């Protein structure tokens, strides 16, 4: 529940209006995979599941 | 290397003893060259050509 | 020593991870002709087994900025290094350019392109950047002798990592971090002088003879 | 830092032969500051 309601802010900060802001998407994508312990690392392919 | 039982040979790197494999380049083979010193991590002074 | 490394200086990677006993020193190496992927040569235990430095050495070519690299690669057809610069590393023996690959191994997803020599410099996947790795140094500062740092591929966002996987401590471009240290080797020296690591002939007399071994396919072992 | 900043800014318009109006103002802003820094350094040395 905590993770689902936490990244919803980023969903609004990267999809401005029907488009993808390249000035922030590139930074966000790097940060998502900067730490492997993200996006539910237990069962998202990071931990091997 | 010098195997101390067959003379000067060439040995594999797997069993390359440090004392046997170690050699030296000098001049005027007599006089019993003194102990090494001046451990400088630079290019060093001019040497043989 | 300020470690100028004025775009012409041999360098070797000297990073390792504390795995077996004391982070045994491993150096990145490759042979080129044959398997393109790089491997690791132990070097701390040089007394029992000598290291293989013939194919382990690397040389430095360019130290341009990120924007300078972008301009150069957009328009194609002696100076000290500065922290946060694009780097160009070549294999000394096989004369190939150190780069990354487009394939992975280990059967896990774990997106990590293999590190291997490239036939030609062009391809946008050859350069690396020495990014800040410790608080002791800062972006825009110089580089010192034996200064640990992190190398990031220009194309692959993943760092250059010593992937201590189930194998024999492979090197893979995964999104981990390890302080890759660089140690220097011979540089601009006197013309016609002896150097450690030079393949040489020991000649006696004008043209009398030279140090040799028995020819190939000899009756006795070539010892 | 200012010298490195302007040098990096130089490797942005090198390919292009036309400098935009926004780029012209930014160049003037940095150079007008660099001159002030240079004058301050001179006053530390004059009167030797």
From Swiss-Prot, chain B:
Residues 1-43 form the MIR domain. Signal peptide: none annotated. The N-terminus is blocked. Detected in skeletal muscle (at protein level). Fast- or slow-twitch skeletal muscle. It is found in: Sarcoplasmic reticulum membrane. Homotetramer. Can also form heterotetramers with RYR2. Identified in a complex composed of RYR1, PDE4D, PKA, FKBP1A and protein phosphatase 1 (PP1). Repeated very high-level exercise decreases interaction with PDE4D and protein phosphatase 1 (PP1). Interacts with CALM; CALM with bound calcium inhibits the RYR1 channel activity. Interacts with S100A1. Interacts with FKBP1A; this stabilizes the closed conformation of the channel. Interacts with CACNA1S; interaction with CACNA1S is important for activation of the RYR1 channel. Interacts with CACNB1. Cytosolic calcium-activated calcium channel that mediates the release of Ca(2+) from the sarcoplasmic reticulum into the cytosol and thereby plays a key role in triggering muscle contraction following depolarization of T-tubules. Repeated very high-level exercise increases the open probability of the channel and leads to Ca(2+) leaking into the cytoplasm. Can also mediate the release of Ca(2+) from intracellular stores in neurons, and may thereby promote prolonged Ca(2+) signaling in the brain. Required for normal embryonic development of muscle fibers and skeletal muscle. Binding of [3H]ryanodine indicates that the heterozygous channel is activated by Ca(2+) concentrations 4-fold lower than normal. Single-cell analysis of cotransfected cells shows a significantly increased resting cytoplasmic Ca(2+) level and a significantly reduced luminal Ca(2+) level. Belongs to the ryanodine receptor (TC 1.A.3.1) family. RYR1 subfamily. The calcium release channel activity resides in the C-terminal region while the remaining part of the protein constitutes the 'foot' structure spanning the junctional gap between the sarcoplasmic reticulum (SR) and the T-tubule. Pore opening is mediated via the cytoplasmic calcium-binding domains that mediate a small rotation of the channel-forming transmembrane regions that then leads to channel opening. This is Ryanodine receptor 1. It comes from Oryctolagus cuniculus. The chain holds residues 292 to 340 of 5037 of the full protein.
